[PDB]
Write a protein that binds this ligand. Structure first.
Ligand SMILES: C=C(C/C=C(/C)CCC=C(C)C)CCC(C)(C)/C=C/CC/C(C)=C\CO[C@H](COP(=O)(O)O[C@H]1O[C@H](C(N)=O)[C@@](C)(O)[C@H](OC(N)=O)[C@H]1O[C@@H]1O[C@H](CO[C@@H]2O[C@H](CO)[C@@H](O)[C@H](O)[C@H]2O)[C@@H](O[C@@H]2O[C@H](C)[C@@H](O[C@@H]3O[C@H](C(=O)NC4=C(O)C=CC4=O)[C@H](O)[C@H](O)[C@H]3O)[C@H](O)[C@H]2NC(C)=O)[C@H](O)[C@H]1NC(C)=O)C(=O)O
Ligand SMILES: C=C(C/C=C(/C)CCC=C(C)C)CCC(C)(C)/C=C/CC/C(C)=C\CO[C@H](COP(=O)(O)O[C@H]1O[C@H](C(N)=O)[C@@](C)(O)[C@H](OC(N)=O)[C@H]1O[C@@H]1O[C@H](CO[C@@H]2O[C@H](CO)[C@@H](O)[C@H](O)[C@H]2O)[C@@H](O[C@@H]2O[C@H](C)[C@@H](O[C@@H]3O[C@H](C(=O)NC4=C(O)C=CC4=O)[C@H](O)[C@H](O)[C@H]3O)[C@H](O)[C@H]2NC(C)=O)[C@H](O)[C@H]1NC(C)=O)C(=O)O
Ligand SMILES: *C(=O)[C@@H](NC(=O)/C(=N\OC(C)(C)C(=O)O)c1csc(N)n1)[C@H](C)NS(=O)(=O)O
Ligand SMILES: *C(=O)[C@@H](NC(=O)/C(=N\OC(C)(C)C(=O)O)c1csc(N)n1)[C@H](C)NS(=O)(=O)O
Lengths: 733, 733
């Protein structure tokens, strides 16, 4: 003719263009679809019968782990409260130790301990019950696209319907050949074009997002149609919407694109997609059309009407009715955290990233769908953050200041595992992390090292050992004379104090005489074993009183070493690093090292309970007498810094209060740091400190003179002896 | 399947795209293909037996009309020269009066006249033989494309072959479907592309030039191919190359695109395409590929090799052989005018355009293929141009000057038809046309008006009338006294001069006395009838001597009025304006008006032959005594201007010489203008002036006293009398 000969030649190369398209769609799908960023999780708590935890403590623990209080549990991630129990649906979690599904459980309490954890489905007791970890954040992926991969089955059939009720019928590929005829006929041609009117199948919307550019292609829709004919031909409808539901752009976080319903549900609502309500699903689905302008942060009015349109669109099709309509529209969209949620826990994340580098180097950022399990505690953090946010403006007002900063570090007493980190007064927005970057003179926090060095010598130094408290003059290597004074510029009437009272009252003059008698090399060695940085130790008499500049985290290591009964446990934020296939890339293990004798650490801890009960920290002791806290105070010269090292039955807490410019704070007696700690304790349930005396510890009596007696005596002090017959040697006088 | 269903849908709209293309190709072709600019032609000379023209004059006339001297006439537009004849092939020309073809004719001479014009094909005498006009220029078309439409038959079969030997086989449409397979296979694909290698049929090259843009369309060649399938399907191969041969870009003229072989042949060679030689055809054809870089003006080396490649390409195919090859390559390309040929005859063209406006207004520029027939003379122009180009540097050297300008105007003595116009010393490049724009004091060129006013009164003023030549003092309307002097500051011994000698010697004092006796209103009226602009006449005594500022063209009208025997014929450059269909848009006709009596003009002309023979212009008279030229001289005060008005048997020539800044030229006695005229006469064949005395003219004798005598007398002067018996009335004394 011949429009066929050449018109047939058109058919040939467009079908081979189609086999250039199929051969390239496979390359994407058959393997790496996206670079899935790392998942960062908090601690995984194991509930156990007889555990020292109360009903009120557990509610706060559950709430802190994304659990919602209800009256009728219908969903996973919910809990009810009774007079003596908690009923919960422990959500399914891919636990490293063993994968688990939903568990309907009852936690029966008998104050202040958990008695039983019973499965409500079989009436059987659990030897131990696992709590799922809370997702802290995602480590930013380079191409700026954030996703949390959830398989097809993770998506509830309802959200699947809510989606189809807005964008499909799903009998597709060919993709609505008749839609193109109406879609282009409605507008009555004429160039365009407005409205088209959303002439796109789910398989057309997928190919667009996954494979094609933003716009300028009227050629694209037809090129996308060509791809939406290949995809639904070789991939089942189940895979189409598995890929689709993880790709869809749903929001923004500065320079990071929030995409896919799984990460979106947590981002806007704080729940994994499986736990979403219908009003929540409808909004999320409705956002798809335009994710940026349907922002419940920026313009709720618009989003509050869209969600409501999806509510009204769903009732039009089969599923719902106005009995559940009128109320669903009334329910406010959010359920909105109200925070920008740009960078969660920045201070604690610096430690995580630093530790990730030290343990795996570079060849870890190469991998996809990585799972990072941290030591992070949600309860301890919230309490520390609150103490900072509330305590700082309170102190600024009382003392009257224009600026004031803080730093809190909470570590496991025994394991060294970091539970909480506060880098400033505004922890929600941080760039300077004072917990790891603020190097400061520790002041009187340097005192226990000297007493721990002395008490490590049980045949020479004991708690009843008399120390001179009289004027000092120390000739130094310039000729200048060092004359240290006690905070009050006074000396003891008798010219002497006992070791026990010298540390209880943080006495300067008796600490120098003790330190100088032991010698600086000896005290310098204790500091090394406690775990402080080697390059910060300058062995001059001044260091016995605080001429030692450390960060709160470095201080936390030193006090952990002593709080654990003499075992130095290197501080850490990493519990494990797991690949998507389940390969254990990194696994932490106990590496605690015996630093100082058990008995020497016990006598220091016992004396530290005395500072809190009757000495420098007595104001705290009187507020919480039943906790028997072991602590130590710090106030540097010219009120530059206030410090507090507090030990409960479970944690070591280092609180620092000072100004970024190193200026006076008008606060003394560790008043700043001690009242921030006071709030931290008031904001949660601290563990009472019950000291287990190690072997060779004997409570001995002394007379007013400080000499051991057989029976009686006016004062009882613990002593490191296998044979308390030091009494006889003393009594024989 | 279904790549056919939709692959068949592709066939449908591309064929209807083809019926959108056919419906739009017709719109262009079926009527106005281009806006064909106006054709401007010189005079059409009619050769006639007994005509006062010599063999040498005719050779120069033929050469000036694009005729070539040869030894063996083989082509139209050629001529041979014998001892007593000229043999020529008068080219075919579309004459307004009657269309004509080639005529092989012999012009037999019998010095100084043409005796016979015989047709060499039938041995028959012509009553009159038409000479074809020379193309001066083309009036610029707005879209900047210049073309001269020649039909299919106007193109010789050889140039047609020379073209096919370079760009075709011509069995086309489909257009070399196999060329696309080789053209794209030779380069071995890979994007491009170099060389393609000229994969284009003549029908593809046409559609490209006529319908499509410059580049960026790999889509264009296929779109052009689609058009090259439609054109050769509905238009015969004869029409294809009729359109093609008028479209092809062949050269540039500043901002005007020279396109099509007809206008190109004249542009580079100076001959209509039918008259081209094979080396000429080959070059022109070869230029097509690239017309700009194959420029015989800019880079001959390149063009001298291309033409030679076309010579070598033609021998490869059938037609030629090296016997006519080696020589054809040796022949230098041009045959090149060597002029930029931007704007031919700019000075004379201003008059044409001015006259075109006055006669047809605006609704003439709307029309296409217009033919303008002018009064322009090639022989007179070349002679005038040469006199200017040679005379001016000659005068600059002799007198020693840094600047000097000129202006020459040549008009038909009887009809007023403008034959030549020079606007400056450099006529080849002009923007200021001094012939129509230089308003100057005419000086002594104002003298004949007064004598013509006096001689118009035959009973009062005659040639023998005595005029006083004595000191003058004229009281004027400020109180100041006008005392004019003769050029030499002397007066006649007798205190008197005769009318005849007063004008012969351009005497100032006797011209004032005569003018004042006639009165200024009378002399002012002669000036009106002569045809000078009414607003330039300021009736004060000073105007009798040259206080009258005119342009050389205005001066040409005044002297034409007197040279024609008293008939004012309004000056013109337009003979006719004809449409392409042959519609006479404008036709000029004789409109001569009786201004002054025949006898008064005769006596002024006779006296003007005396100035040339024995008076002010005697230097010219002695060089050409047999021409009996009637003339008048002019030198303004402070040698600002030199003028000369010269009359031969056929023309009035106004020559002006002066400086643009109105400064001294050191030239007197009309030396500048008179020697430019001298050269103009030496550069051609002037017509001897033979005055036919009108009715009532009688040659009468006068004695030394200036009184009419019966017989004898020492001086014979023509007199306006029906009865020479004024002699008796005089003799009776
Ligand atoms: O073919 C045409 C294709 O047309 P598309 O425009 O390409 O598809 C949009 O319009 C369709 C239509 N035919 O009606 C549609 C309504 O069916 C589309 O919905 C679909 N496909 O389900 C609609 O797609 C959506 O287009 C949204 C908004 O389109 C906007 O609609 C208006 C007309 O509706 C125009 O006037 C808009 O300007 C046009 O933008 C897409 O949203 C955009 O998605 C982008 C990722 C966002 O870019 C980010 O924005 C961020 C930010 O703003 N903050 C940052 O700057 C970040 O740097 C930047 O990367 C961008 O912020 C975000 N903007 C909005 C309003 O939502 C959203 O990204 C995208 N959704 C999907 C499922 O792919 C067709 O299929 O119809
Ligand atoms: O399809 C592709 C189409 O390719 P084309 O380039 O569009 O066709 C050129 O190349 C062909 C080829 N396939 O090999 C070809 C050789 O077959 C063409 O010859 C044909 N068609 O017979 C050749 O066409 C010619 O292209 C000439 C030169 O092309 C040049 O070739 C080089 C590669 O050969 C490139 O590197 C050149 O730069 C490319 O320019 C055309 O010439 C141009 O034609 C234009 C009218 C001129 O523009 C004017 O120039 C003036 C001036 O320069 N002075 C003024 O500026 C004026 O303002 C301006 O309008 C312009 O001055 C003038 N330039 C030259 C070198 O000749 C000339 O205008 C034009 N001829 C015809 C018959 O249409 C194809 O058919 O092949
Ligand atoms: C302990 O922190 C202790 N303070 C000091 O030893 C320091 N300064 O205190 C003096 C008396 C110099 C003061 O001017 O207030 C000190 C050591 S290092 C450094 N930069 N300053 C206090 C008194 N004990 S506490 O219990 O009050 O905190
Ligand atoms: C004629 O052209 C005539 N010249 C004059 O009349 C003029 N000037 O001549 C004088 C004597 C003033 C001079 O200084 O040279 C004249 C008239 S109008 C004007 N601007 N100047 C001459 C002398 N006759 S001719 O035959 O030589 O040309």
């Amino acid at each position: 003719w011949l429009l066929l000969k050449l018109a047939i030649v058109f058919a040939v190369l467009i079908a081979i263009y189609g086999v250039y398209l199929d051969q390239k769609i496979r390359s994407r799908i058959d393997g790496k679809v996206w670079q899935l960023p790392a998942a960062v999780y908090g601690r995984m708590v194991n509930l156990e019968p007889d555990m020292t935890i109360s009903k009120n403590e557990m509610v706060k623990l559950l709430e802190a782990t994304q659990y919602r209080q209800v009256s009728k549990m219908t969903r996973p991630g919910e809990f009810t409260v009774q007079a003596n129990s908690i009923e919960m649906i422990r959500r399914p979690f891919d636990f490293p130790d063993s994968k688990e599904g939903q568990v309907r459980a009852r936690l029966t309490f008998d104050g202040d301990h958990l008695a039983t954890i019973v499965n409500m489905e079989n009436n059987r007791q659990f030897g131990f019950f696992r709590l799922d970890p809370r997702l802290i954040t995602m480590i930013s992926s380079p191409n700026g696209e954030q996703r949390l991969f959830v398989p097809r089955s993770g998506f509830p059939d309802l959200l699947v319907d809510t989606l189809l009720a807005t964008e499909d019928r799903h009998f597709y590929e060919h993709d609505g050949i008749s839609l193109y005829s109406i879609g282009r006929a409605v507008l009555a041609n004429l160039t365009a074009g407005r409205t088209v009117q959303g002439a796109s199948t789910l398989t057309q919307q997928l190919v667009k997002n996954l494979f094609l550019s933003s716009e300028r292609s009227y050629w694209r829709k037809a090129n996308e149609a060509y791809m939406a004919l290949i995809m639904d031909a070789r991939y089942s409808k189940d895979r189409i919407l598995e890929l689709y539901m993880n790709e869809v752009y749903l929001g923004q976080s500065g320079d990071n694109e929030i995409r896919g319903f799984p990460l979106a549900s947590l981002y806007y609502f704080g729940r994994p997609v499986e736990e979403l309500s219908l009003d929540q699903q409808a909004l999320l689905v409705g956002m798809v059309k335009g994710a940026s302008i349907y922002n419940p942060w920026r313009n709720p009015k618009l989003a509050l009407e869209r969600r409501n349109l999806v509510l009204r669109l769903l009732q039009q099709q089969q599923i719902i009715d106005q009995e559940l309509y009128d109320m669903l529209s009334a329910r406010p969209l959010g359920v909105q955290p109200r925070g920008g949620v740009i960078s969660p826990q920045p201070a604690f994340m610096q430690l995580v990233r630093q530790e990730l580098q030290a343990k795996l180097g570079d060849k870890v950022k190469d991998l996809s769908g990585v799972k990072i399990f941290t030591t992070f505690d949600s309860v301890a953090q919230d309490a520390a953050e609150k103490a900072a946010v509330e305590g700082i403006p309170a102190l600024k007002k009382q003392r009257k200041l224009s600026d004031l900063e803080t730093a809190i570090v909470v570590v496991d007493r025994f394991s060294g595992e970091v539970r909480a980190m506060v880098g400033g007064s505004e922890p929600q927005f941080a760039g300077y992390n004072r917990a790891m970057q603020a190097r400061r003179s520790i002041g009187s926090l340097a005192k226990p090292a000297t007493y721990l060095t002395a008490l490590s010598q049980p045949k020479i130094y004991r708690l009843n050992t008399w120390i001179a408290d009289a004027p000092i003059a120390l000739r130094q290597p310039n000729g200048q004379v060092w004359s240290p004074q006690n905070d009050d510029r006074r000396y003891s009437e008798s010219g002497r104090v006992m070791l026990v009272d010298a540390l209880t009252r943080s006495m300067n003059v008796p600490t120098v005489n003790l330190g100088m008698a032991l010698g600086l090399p000896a005290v310098t060695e204790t500091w090394i074993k406690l775990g402080v940085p080697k390059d910060q130790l300058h062995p001059v008499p001044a260091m016995l009183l605080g001429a030692l500049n450390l960060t709160p985290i470095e201080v936390a290591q030193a006090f952990q070493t002593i709080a654990s009964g003499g075992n130095r446990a290197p501080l850490s934020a990493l519990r494990s690093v797991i690949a998507e296939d389940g390969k254990v890339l990194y696994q932490s293990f106990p590496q605690a090292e015996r630093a100082v004798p058990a008995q020497a650490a016990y006598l220091t801890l016992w004396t530290m309970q005395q500072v809190v009960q009757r000495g420098t920290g007595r104001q705290l002791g009187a507020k919480y007498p039943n906790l028997h806290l072991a602590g130590k105070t710090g106030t540097t010269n010219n009120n530059v810094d206030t410090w507090f090292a507090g030990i409960d039955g479970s944690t070591v807490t280092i609180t620092w209060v000072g100004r970024d410019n190193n200026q006076p704070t008008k606060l003394y007696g560790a008043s700043g740091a001690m009242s921030i700690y006071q709030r931290y304790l008031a904001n949660q349930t601290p563990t009472p400190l019950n000291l287990v005396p190690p072997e060779d510890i004997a409570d001995m009596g002394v007379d007013y003179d400080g000499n051991f007696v057989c029976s009686g005596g006016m004062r009882i002090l613990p002593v490191w002896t296998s044979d308390p017959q030091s009494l006889c040697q003393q009594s024989e006088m």
